[PDB]
Every structure is written in C-alpha cells, then in structure tokens.
Design a protein around this ligand. Sequence first.
Ligand SMILES: CC(C)CN(C[C@@H](O)[C@H](Cc1ccccc1)NC(=O)O[C@H]1CO[C@H]2OCC[C@H]21)S(=O)(=O)c1ccc(N)cc1
Lengths: 99, 99
Amino acid sequence: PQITLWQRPLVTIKIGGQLKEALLDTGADDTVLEEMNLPGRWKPKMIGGIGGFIKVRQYDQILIEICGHKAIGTVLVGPTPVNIIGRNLLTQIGCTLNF
Amino acid sequence: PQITLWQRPLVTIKIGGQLKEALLDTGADDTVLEEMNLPGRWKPKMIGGIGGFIKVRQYDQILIEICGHKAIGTVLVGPTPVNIIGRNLLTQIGCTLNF
Ligand SMILES: CC(C)CN(C[C@@H](O)[C@H](Cc1ccccc1)NC(=O)O[C@H]1CO[C@H]2OCC[C@H]21)S(=O)(=O)c1ccc(N)cc1
C-alpha cells in the first residue's frame, strides 16, 4: 500500500516462523534485526550508524515476509535497538519513495 | 518525483545558504545534519541510533529546501556520519513510501 510518514513506518514481518514488527527504513543499506535465532550458517560483520558501530551476525538467503510480500535476502542479527528493513529487502518488495 | 531504492535515496538540499547532499531516511524520526553553522538559538539534545548516542544541537524553525520543496522545521546538528532528512521534514514535503 501507500504509507505517509506522520508515524514510524512499522510493518509486520514473518521470519523463521516468528512474527515481528519492523521499521521500513530507506536510510538503512541492510536489514538488521534484534537478537533472534536464525537457523543456518552466518558470518561476523560490523555495521555503523549514528553513535558508532555494532557487531552483527550476517545470514544470507533468508526468507522474510514483509507486510505480505515475500523476499529472500541477507539479514543481519545483533543489538540494534529496533528491527529495521533496509534497502536490500525494500527493493525486493518494490518499495518506492514518492513526493 | 518517485524514487526506487537500488541506490541510497540521496537528494540535494539547500540550508543556511549552503548546498548539501542528504539521505531521505524514513527510519529517522528527526533530521540530523553534519557540523555546520546554523544561525540562531539552539538547545543541547541527545539522539540514539545503532551503536549508541550522539550529542546534537537542536535548531527550531529552520528553512530547508529539499529537492526543490521548501520545509520549515527542526534541524539537529552534530557528528552524524551522513546528512539525514527524517520524518519531521519528509512529512512536510509530502513524502510517502509505496509498495
Ligand atoms: C536505526 C534507526 C531506527 C534510526 N537511524 C536512522 C537510520 O536510517 C540510519 C541512518 C544512518 C545512515 C548512515 C550512517 C548512520 C546512520 N541507518 C542505519 O543505521 O543503517 C545501518 C543499517 O545498514 C547500514 O546502512 C547505513 C548505516 C547502517 S539513526 O541514524 O540512528 C537516527 C536516529 C534518530 C534520528 N533523529 C535520526 C537518525
């Protein structure tokens, strides 16, 4: 659907059989989720934001359903304060900014 | 215009007579710019992201032109690694997410 930005653009996501809320985040290159068990192989990685950097686990080719749209991509897991859906997955669900 | 997300959604802004590049950032509540002279009164403030917090100067009722759309609102100035246009200004230029 189309969404305005008067409130945080939070959507429901389903990943690893679990239901979560996550922020559609055009300022995030990558998707980063708070601590959870994703099954399979991962690689250590560091991502930076405002305030500095966090260590994350990088999981590749993970299936996520974002507000009813399925995407398969890289998910990072670590101590982000908020679940964020980044451009790597936004592109797959055909998400655009409009003004 | 309409903007896809294969690349960072970077736009030209004009603020305090200066031309800068800034990221349209639906994951940011606030607009935060890197160090610059904004004229007038400010207040100390702290904002948090991934990796922790930064101290910023809060300037109210600042005029910004974002990709040719004028907005007046709060601008935060501080050691963000990237100029980010947040929802406080995105709403004023009628910016929407669609998928
Ligand atoms: C994490 C969000 C809930 C909030 N952040 C906005 C977010 O878009 C930042 C915006 C951002 C962009 C660049 C550098 C720092 C912060 N992106 C970000 O942290 O993304 C990380 C995930 O992938 C990587 O892509 C870029 C940074 C990494 S934030 O920068 O911390 C932020 C917080 C509060 C305000 N008022 C403004 C911005």
